[PDB]
RNA sequence: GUCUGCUUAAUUGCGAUAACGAACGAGACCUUAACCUACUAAAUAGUGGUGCUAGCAUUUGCUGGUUAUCCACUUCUUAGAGGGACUAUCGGUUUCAAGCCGAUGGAAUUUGAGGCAAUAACAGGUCUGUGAUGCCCUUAGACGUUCUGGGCCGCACGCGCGCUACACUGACGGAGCCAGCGAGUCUAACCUUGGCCGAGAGGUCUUGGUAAUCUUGGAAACUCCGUCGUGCUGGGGAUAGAGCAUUGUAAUUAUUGCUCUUCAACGAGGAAUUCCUAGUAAGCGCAAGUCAUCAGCUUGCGUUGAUUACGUCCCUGCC
RNA sequence: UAGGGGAUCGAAGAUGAUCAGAUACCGUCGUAGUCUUAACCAUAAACUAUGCCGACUAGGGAUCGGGUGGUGUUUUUUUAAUGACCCACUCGGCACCUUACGAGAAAUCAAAGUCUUUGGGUUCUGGGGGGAGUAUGGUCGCAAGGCUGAAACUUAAAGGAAUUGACGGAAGGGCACCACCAGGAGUGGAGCCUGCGGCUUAAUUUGACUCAACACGGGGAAACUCACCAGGUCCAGACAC
RNA sequence: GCCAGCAGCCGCGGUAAUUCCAGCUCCAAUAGCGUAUAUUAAAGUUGUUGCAGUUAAAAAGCUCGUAGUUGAACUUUGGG
């Protein structure tokens, strides 16, 4: 076999990152455009490169593919980065949980602890 | 013979060439031969390539000692050509597409 | 053309540093070479040894040609580096900068009788590569530089002059000999005599004082 | 650099990388087999229409014959230009890399196949291809040249490469009755029909052909219709006796053939051990290479044409 | 060496196996010895194949033995107490990792470092390879044997580390039905083809012998071809003297 | 034509020998050259200056020791 090559993977790639946008999976309408873009040697080896590619947006929909990003996916990590509001404010159990033995340091440090703690395994 | 053997490669390097390797077989100060090889740039040994890229040659040789074989091997620039081939048949080169701006609202004319 | 690279190169072509006793001050690195062609000119090459090996293929024999190369100019400032490589014409050459960016200095100075333009070194040092040990000894005038053919040489280079010397040590190795004696004059520096002790107070690094140049 | 890994027909490629980018090999390229109802032309290819025409029907029909009766054609058949396929299109399958399955369209396992085939060589073979050739020997009682006769074809036997056959799934016979690779005479006898003579093997008159123009559109496995009936036969075709022919100055250690009879083993092949994944394994032929002939070999083709995988490192072998 | 002990192993000895031989490897038995008392011998790859004293260089993280400190971890019993524990520190080990500023022929080495810049203290040893740790004397021992230790003669290398051109009947990976599966048609059997062994002969011309010799030099030769003979000839012996 | 012979050692010579025998030709010393022996430097391959002892040839099997050999520091500096 049917086993993939460099020149071609690495010719897709490159591709690939630029023309995510003209892009497609009916691969006969990459073929002709993988021709305006790359200035490819040959007809079979530029049938091999699209073969690769739709192998890529037949896959990116599905999901996160790997070590390849191209502006669109990356803006989707500052839109699905962000989260839990509220941040943390505890009424219930109002008290924070404060081992027991967390009183000396910070009655030797502070300022307003609204804590909590386990009276002695 | 070693010096020559490099005005042969860097007459021919100046010589906005790609590549070029040197062998060298026959006797020498020795009894028992040998070959030498030399060489410059990047240089293919298979296809159609060769046939249109490189080429060779040999030129025979009548020391008196015993006789000799020369051979070249240039390598021709794809670019510098008109032959067929323009590259390798490897070679996948890429534009580095346009820089766009965005929609505005609609937008028309008359003319 | 030059060219450069990283936030050291760029500084010394555009040529924001001058000497070579900032850098050793700070004590930066060096990667590119042309940081001291800049700067050193004064700068002459020598080739002491070429051997042959060797790595021994299936029906035969692989040879390359160590060279081993020692660079530098009167005052205080030596280079040393090795590059196996095949053929003489990578194998010298890229053996000559592989000097260059080992370049080191010295600490010429006084025997006794302070009087006035230094000839020997400051101190007693002392050198070891596997097997050889070098001491070298602070001689009167000129005395003579008291060794072999080779570290005559790398001393000359390194003025330096005068200095008695003695070995130990296996030279003849010639490549672990000089690997040695070369550290211990980069050595002369690292080792307090009361004339240091008078505290510097550091100045300010390079790598943000000339922050912007130093990028795009 | 030339590598852990995954990758392939492949140092074939992604990727891992104080290693960056190239040369040769491989692949690219050349041969041929497929496809083009688009082009370009064909009394050395064939169509209808056209008569002239020879039969059956009579129904206008059906079956012809015609290197010109004319023309018109160019699917066909040739063959130049040309084009055309890239594993393509989704679907999976993976580092969603190089790749690999499958189904659709398609004429179409590297499209099939050869051929060119680095790097270093081997004291493999060859002076018995040489007027290529070192140095020894031969130089007229030559080992040089040439007319004869036999000799390399001599057998108790040892070792390979091969032909037919142990059957009724065949041997004999009528009656159907089908290709493709060629070749070929000139300064002289290469192919030969046709029409006779011969049971036949042939003989010949005479014919054409320097050839898509002639012999040349008729090859065998087979469908036909059966006799043979489980009889070493009506499988087997050994070895023999003569004649008759067809070449060859010489037919003897019968070159081949025919005419009819002698009717040898072997009744599916031990220790071994090969070659083979598609029109492929193998069998039925034939044209060439010898050549005056004598093929049970070398090459090349097609006409019928399946099993069995389409994977491993158990082995050998080599990397 | 003389008493005691004498299970098991087990030279020696015997055996059966394997094998061309096998006095060895493999198997089963087996004195002696292994064990101990008392007395000998003093050698070893007695091995870090690295003399000891010292003093100084550069990072670590373990561990054994101590000791010091932390309202340190559990023990819970009431708090302690110790103790185990944790960590901090140290001195002394027994090593190890990592660098290489040094050293080296290198492989590697915190010592083989501080050595041509040649010197902290001192005891042994070697000066090419063999002859040979023999012959000799001298000596310790009962003996085995040790320590001491020649020369004549002979010889241009013997050796150390490391290198891939290569090599292995060592490991780990690939690739091919000239390698196996899955199988088909067979070759080897014979009736016969030829071709290479060989005996024969007037002569039975001649290359070729594991894959790379065997219907192969396009070798299908009645003359010829033609190289074997058994024989007939004629020279197709230039050039100069 | 692996026989003569040369060659201090590496080595030539088994049909075209840059080595032998000899011709020409050249090179070195030169009224003086070679040759053998002994010694020197070369020899840091006897070594105190200056060696080697991880495996090259060498750290004793390990410890105690009478000689031998080395042996912490401190006893007036400074100033006039």
Redesign the pocket.
């Known amino acids: 076999?049917?086993?993939?090559?460099?020149?071609?993977?690495?010719?897709?790639?490159?591709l690939?990152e630029r023309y995510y946008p003209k892009l497609?999976?009916?691969?006969?309408?990459?073929?002709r455009l993988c021709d305006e873009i790359a200035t490819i040697?040959?007809?079979?080896?530029?049938?091999?490169?699209?073969?690769?590619?739709?192998?890529?947006?037949?896959?990116?929909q599905?999901g996160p593919?790997?070590?390849?990003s191209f502006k669109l996916q990356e803006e989707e990590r500052e839109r699905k980065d962000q989260y839990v509001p509220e941040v943390k404010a505890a009424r219930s159990n109002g008290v924070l949980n404060v081992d027991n033995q967390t009183s000396?340091?910070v009655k030797?440090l502070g300022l307003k602890l609204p804590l909590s703690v386990i009276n002695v395994? | 013979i070693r010096r020559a053997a490099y005005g042969v490669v860097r007459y021919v390097m100046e010589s906005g060439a790609?590549?070029?390797?040197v062998?060298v077989?026959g006797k020498l100060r020795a009894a028992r031969?040998?070959?030498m090889?030399f060489?410059?740039?990047?240089?293919?040994?298979?296809?159609?390539?060769?046939?249109?890229?490189?080429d060779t040659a040999t030129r025979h040789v009548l020391m008196?000692?015993?006789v000799l074989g020369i051979?070249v091997?240039?390598?021709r620039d794809p670019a510098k050509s008109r032959t067929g081939?323009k590259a390798?048949?490897?070679?996948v080169t890429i534009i580095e597409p346009k820089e766009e701006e965005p929609i505005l609202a609609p937008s028309v004319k008359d003319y | 053309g030059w060219v450069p690279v990283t936030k050291l190169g760029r500084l010394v072509k555009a040529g924001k540093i001058t000497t070579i006793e900032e850098i050793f001050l700070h004590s930066l690195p060096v990667?590119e070479f042309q940081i001291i062609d800049t700067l050193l000119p004064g700068l002459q090459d020598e080739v002491m040894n070429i051997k042959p090996?060797?790595?021994?293929?299936?029906?035969?024999?692989?040879?390359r040609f160590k060279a081993v190369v020692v660079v530098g100019d009167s005052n205080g400032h030596v280079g040393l580096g090795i590059k196996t490589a095949?053929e003489v014409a990578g194998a010298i050459r890229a053996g000559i900068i592989i000097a260059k960016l080992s370049v080191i200095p010295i600490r010429r100075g006084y025997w006794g009788t302070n009087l006035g333009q230094p000839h020997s070194?400051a101190t007693?040092?002392?050198?070891?590569?596997?097997?050889?040990?070098?001491?070298?000894?602070?001689?009167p005038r000129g005395s003579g530089?008291?060794?072999?053919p080779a570290?005559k040489k790398?001393?000359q280079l390194a003025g330096?002059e005068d200095?008695?010397?003695?070995?130990?040590?296996?030279?003849?190795?010639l490549?672990?000999?000089?690997?040695?004696?070369?550290?211990?004059?980069?050595?002369t520096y690292?080792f307090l005599t009361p004339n240091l002790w008078a505290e510097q107070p550091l100045p300010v690094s390079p790598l943000d004082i000339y922050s912007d140049e130093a990028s795009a």
């Open positions: 076999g049917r086993v993939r090559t460099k020149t071609v993977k690495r010719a897709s790639k490159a690939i497609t999976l009916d691969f006969q309408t990459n073929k040697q040959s007809k079979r080896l530029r049938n091999k490169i699209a073969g690769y590619t739709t192998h890529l947006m037949k896959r990116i599905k593919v790997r070590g390849i000396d340091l030797s395994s | 790609k590549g070029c390797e062998v077989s031969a040998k070959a090889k060489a410059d740039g990047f240089l293919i040994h298979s296809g159609q390539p060769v046939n249109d890229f490189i008196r000692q015993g051979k091997k240039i390598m081939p390798l048949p490897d070679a | 990667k090996v060797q790595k021994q293929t299936r029906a035969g024999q692989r040879t095949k070194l007693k040092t002392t050198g070891k590569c596997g097997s050889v040990t070098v001491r070298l000894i602070p001689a530089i008291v060794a072999s570290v790398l001393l330096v200095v008695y010397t003695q070995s130990n040590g296996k030279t003849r190795t490549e672990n000999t000089l690997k040695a004696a070369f550290v211990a004059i980069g050595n690292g």
